[PDB]
Amino acid sequence: TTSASSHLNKGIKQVYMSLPQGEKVQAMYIWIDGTGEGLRCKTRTLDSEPKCVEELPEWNFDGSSTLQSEGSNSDMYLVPAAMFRDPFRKDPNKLVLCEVFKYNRRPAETNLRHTCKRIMDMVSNQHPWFGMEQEYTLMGTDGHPFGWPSNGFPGPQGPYYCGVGADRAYGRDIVEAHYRACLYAGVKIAGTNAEVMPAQWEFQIGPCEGISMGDHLWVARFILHRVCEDFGVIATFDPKPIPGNWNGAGCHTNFSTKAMREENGLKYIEEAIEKLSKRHQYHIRAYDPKGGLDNARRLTGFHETSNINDFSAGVANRSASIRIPRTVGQEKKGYFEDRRPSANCDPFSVTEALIRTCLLNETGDEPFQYKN
């Protein structure tokens, strides 16, 4: 059910961690791996506490161990990009998110922040905002959802959405610890709730400005993985973890600009939606690390989902693939929600695709190569 490491005595760990540290500081480097969905990390000591992200050194790792290079020139580079406070070691320790490069100082295949930042630099004038809702399922060490009957199923759906009670919610300790850890670290977490099927949860981040959204999301999921490791369970972002009559997991994203946020933005929202209506296949390709075969499992037209190759829009409709909140419609200003993306999406890719389609008016099936 749970891993062997979770059966050790944690009082010993607390006793050891209670010791005073001294004068030197710990820093943890984190980066994306070659599969486009994993994460890796390492630790090193520093002589004094940094005050900003740009006053700490670069590093390197062995690329042949993460299938990002060959043995002859396995060396790769790590360049810091953003830093936060460390909730597992407390102040003055830090967490560092880095960018990958090849031995010739060129971005790696799975490095998309490089282009996303350049794209954001152009529209900084109107400075949009993003907010995403991440869903996940807690799994045991034997390949079954945590807390489910051994080789069986719980009752039918209907009582588990936003439920309270020992027979209606599984694993709230993880959620509470994750919430507090994100708040302490400095990730702007906005809320949480339980999902339709048991052992399924959700948390939301934002609104975030420009490039910071992807960094915030990535650090949040790193923290989730670390906490789950502490408790001895597994967190998975698979879009369809359990086949059959059980809901899937998505990553709905909310978007707005200054024009929409101002008075009478509904017309701008409408024009943006009409622009989006003509790039369905391009966006579907963008929203998946494997081109869309993963999202093919989830999007089937039922269980509060729309069809893979059908575009629609509406107000208060949760199966339209794009919806306007009723309050937003009534007030004639706000944002709109896109609910095609999958749970294992890449925030940089999704955000860049949306920005390109909406603000730069470009069309086709291949992104415009370069802009000044």
Ligand X SMILES: Nc1ncnc2c1ncn2[C@@H]1O[C@H](COP(=O)(O)OP(=O)(O)O)[C@@H](O)[C@H]1O
Write out the residues near ligand X by the rule CB under 6 A.
129, 131, 133, 190-191, 204, 206-207, 252, 254, 256, 261, 334-335, 337
β-pairing, 129-139 vs 200-209, is antiparallel
Q: Which is nearer to ligand X, 139 or 160 (CB)?
A: 160
**Dist CA 3 CA 167 (whole Å):** 24
Contact 283, 358 (CB under 8 A): no
329 is in an annotated binding site: no
Q: Does 252 bind Mg ion (CB under 5 A)?
A: yes
Q: Which is nearer to ligand X, 185 or 220 (CB)?
A: 220
Among 31, 32, 83, 133, binds Mg ion (CB under 5 A): 133
Alpha carbon distances (Å) from 279 to 272, 305, 333, 354: 12, 19, 25, 10
Which phi and psi angles does 62 have, rounded to 5°? -95, 110
Considering only residues 154 through 213, tell me which ones interact with a second copy, judged by CB under 8 A: 154-159, 161-167, 169-173, 176-177, 179-181, 183-184, 189-194, 196
Contact letters for a second copy, residues 326-345 (x by CB under 8 A):
xx------------------
216 is in an annotated binding site: no
Mapping DSSP to helix (H, G, I), strand (E, B) and coil, where does residue 295 land?
helix
**Dist CA 291 CA 289 (whole Å):** 6
Considering only residues 269 through 298, tell me which ones interact with a second copy, judged by CB under 8 A: none
135: tokens are: 């869903």
Contact letters for a second copy, residues 110-149 (x by CB under 8 A):
-------------------------------xxxx-xxxx
Which span (83-91, 249-257, 275-283, 333-341) binds a second copy, by CB under 8 A?
83-91
Phi/psi region, residue 193 (left: phi>0; alpha: psi -120 to 50; beta: rest), is beta
Of 146, 10, 28, residue with least CA distance to 85: 28
In angstroms, give the least distance from the CB of 229 to ligand X. Answer: 23
**Dist CA 241 CA 139 (whole Å):** 9
Contact letters for Mg ion, residues 86-125 (x by CB under 5 A):
----------------------------------------
In angstroms, give the least distance from the CB of 133 to ligand X. Answer: 5
DSSP 8-state secondary structure symbol assigned to residue 63: G
**Dist CA 205 CA 217 (whole Å):** 7
204 is in an annotated binding site: yes
**Dist CA 217 CA 209 (whole Å):** 13
Residues in the annotated binding site for ATP: 133, 202-207, 254-256, 318, 323
Binding site for Mg ion (CB under 5 A): 133, 252
Residues in the annotated binding site: 133, 135, 195, 202-207, 245-246, 252, 254-256, 318, 323, 335-337, 339
